[PDB]
Design a protein around this ligand. Structure first.
Ligand SMILES: Nc1ncnc2c1ncn2[C@H]1C[C@H](O)[C@@H](COP(=O)(O)O)O1
Ligand SMILES: Nc1ncnc2c1ncn2[C@H]1C[C@H](O)[C@@H](COP(=O)(O)O)O1
Lengths: 520, 61, 61
């Protein structure tokens, strides 16, 4: 598209309607972009002896980027409700990215007054990494996404990437990337940017919860025709009754003893924590007692491990040491905030397919029992994969991640984003943005010296993201009502999901996705 | 005398979905066929009763 | 008011006793409801009202 100065290069498209078979979410926000790194690429690295498991090496780029890898970027509270309460599952389909109404303001600090004006002849630069040649930095829960509330304005984040490193140093195999060596479209006021993307085939999310259990799958009325051993010694114990091999036919009575066809999902035990700050051990163990992995001799915390249940029945107070995603309430410092200032997510719908995160896995034998030796039991704390296991993945919440770029390696197992969502080989490419550097005043004499005197300026405009969603409708013959998400009809202070007395949108609680029931 | 098939549970993930007791793991296995004798009301009263009906003729098929 | 069924009772309930209980010992008041029957004819739930009105004075011939 190509138009003029006094002619808007786009309209405000923010709406969503339903097709019963699918739903299209249109979102528009206002963005602002500073000049990052002073038009410079900078080599960043770990502090000279400041930390060990946090060593790193990379670069800081003068470029910014757009992101909307949060569900609340597209769905409104209400829409999310309809979605959750009605559909077995859902998925992404298409994508439409649009940049418009661009304005480049240049600022000057004269005396003690900052004046801002229009630099019409100035441009901005956009390009999309569709060849996936730039390090994919999205899908890492970073901030700078689109505001949940449409009326809010946001600052466009800065691009920074990491590389292979040996402590504070780097290896010869490390990689340096210049985004200027990429063809980019430059835009003046009245120019716009267009982009269309098509999601790959990716399994529906589980907007459902099982009404049956793995162990409670059989028939309560009929007995099995299979036999198991339940008595090794205990006979008609009185005279001459040491031991005897006795077998029983499985019945509704021997419910946790019946033959089985399937196993629970894998596991990686997490430490149990209480929300009550006195049930816990009087010691600081959020690192020395937490489950972690290490690569290249570098410890890294296994935060959202395999999908495991948060708590067993009749507790609802013990959450796993970081066994789930925790969201911070609006207005709360990034450094050591209170327990009443965060929102911990409960994964208690997957109890029927998944092992409890804090609890064990089960029992394993590890000896040759006999008259000479007593049978030994081992408590299994870590279980790899097994032929016959079935599990449910995590959950997506209104403010959770949407997709994630599956790493390009030789092998993957069950490539679903650990933080939750859709694992994509080729995910919505990265869209870069940056203000074209404008040389300040040059000398009448020639200078070979690198240019570093520029006019200070920032850009602003609108951005629009349209996404189509395929839906999986609900087909259940459940007689009684199922559970639905709802607002408290009671007389209330402030309205859930709303601005306050001085204009600040706030998301009260996290929103699960599993409210509807399907069988096994 | 062993089992033949087994309905693979409808979850987010499976590994090697073969029935642990042995046989063929099926996403969509031979559906369940139900059967029942249609209830036959025994003798009713000449006066109307809102009470749930529980007097039936005993029969087998 | 005489539109319903003389034989069958309504499945709706109305309140007909506010105090009068097993009146003897410690029986001041109690909320008691009855199911409409052919017996409670002018007490049954209704779907319609009579026409408007503007009272006139009564005269005799
Ligand atoms: N989010 C997501 N993306 C892709 N595949 C998923 C996902 N979640 C579960 N799976 C399952 C579906 C396929 O049966 C299997 C392919 O693994 P492979 O290692 O590709 O053979 O992975
Ligand atoms: N009984 C039975 N049914 C189905 N598949 C079986 C069975 N036994 C072994 N397999 C193997 C065959 C496929 O390579 C794999 C698909 O696993 P998936 O998890 O589907 O990707 O599972």
């Amino acid at each position: 598209g190509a138009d003029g100065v006094g002619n808007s290069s786009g309209n405000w498209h923010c709406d969503s309607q339903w097709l019963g078979d699918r739903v299209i979410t249109t979102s528009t926000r206002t963005w602002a972009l500073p000049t990052y790194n002073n038009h410079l690429y900078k080599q960043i690295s770990s502090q000279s002896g400041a930390s060990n498991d946090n060593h790193y090496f990379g670069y800081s780029t003068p470029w910014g980027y757009f992101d909307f890898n949060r569900f609340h970027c597209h769905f409104s509270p209400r829409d999310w409700q309809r979605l959750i309460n009605n559909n077995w599952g859902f998925r992404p389909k298409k994508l439409s990215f649009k940049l418009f109404n661009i304005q480049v303001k240049e600022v000057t600090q004269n005396d003690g007054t900052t004046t801002i004006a229009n630099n019409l002849t100035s441009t901005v630069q956009v390009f999309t990494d569709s060849e996936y040649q730039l390090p994919y930095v999205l899908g890492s829960a970073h901030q700078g996404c689109l505001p949940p509330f449409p009326a809010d304005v946001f600052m466009v984040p800065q691009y920074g990437y990491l590389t292979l490193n040996n402590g504070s140093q780097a290896v010869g195999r490390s990689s340096f990337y210049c985004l200027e060596y990429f063809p980019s479209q430059m835009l003046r006021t009245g120019n716009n940017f267009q982009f269309s993307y098509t999601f790959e085939d990716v399994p529906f999310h589980s907007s459902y919860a099982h009404s049956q259990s793995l162990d409670r799958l059989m028939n309560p009325l009929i007995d099995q025709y299979l036999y198991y051993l339940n008595r090794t010694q205990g006979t008609t114990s009185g005279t001459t009754n040491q031991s005897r091999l006795l077998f029983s036919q499985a019945g509704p009575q021997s419910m946790s003893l019946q033959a089985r066809n399937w196993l629970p999902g894998p596991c990686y035990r997490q430490q149990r924590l209480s929300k009550t700050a006195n049930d816990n051990n009087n010691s600081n163990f959020p690192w020395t007692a937490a489950s972690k992995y290490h690569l290249n001799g570098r410890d890294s915390l296994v935060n959202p491990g395999p999908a495991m249940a948060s708590h067993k029945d009749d507790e609802e107070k013990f959450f796993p040491m970081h066994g789930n995603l925790i969201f911070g309430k609006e207005g709360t410092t990034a450094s050591n905030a209170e327990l009443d200032n965060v929102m911990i997510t409960d994964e208690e719908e997957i109890r029927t397919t998944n092992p409890v995160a804090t609890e064990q896995y089960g029992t394993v034998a590890n000896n040759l029992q006999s008259s000479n030796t007593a049978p030994t039991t081992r408590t299994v704390n870590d279980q790899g994969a097994l032929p016959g296991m079935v599990w449910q993945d995590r959950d997506v919440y209104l403010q959770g991640p949407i997709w994630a770029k599956i790493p390009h390696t030789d092998g993957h197992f069950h490539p679903s984003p650990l933080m939750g969502g859709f694992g994509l080989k080729h995910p919505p490419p990265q869209i870069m943005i940056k203000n074209t550097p404008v040389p300040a005043n040059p000398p009448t004499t020639f200078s070979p010296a690198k240019f570093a005197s520029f006019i200070t300026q920032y850009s602003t405009g609108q951005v629009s993201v349209e996404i189509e969603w395929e839906l999986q409708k609900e087909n259940s013959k459940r007689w009684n009502p199922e559970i639905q998400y709802t607002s408290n009809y009671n007389k209330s202070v402030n309205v859930d999901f709303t601005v306050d007395t001085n204009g600040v949108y706030s998301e009260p609680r996290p929103i699960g996705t599993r409210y509807l029931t399907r069988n096994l």
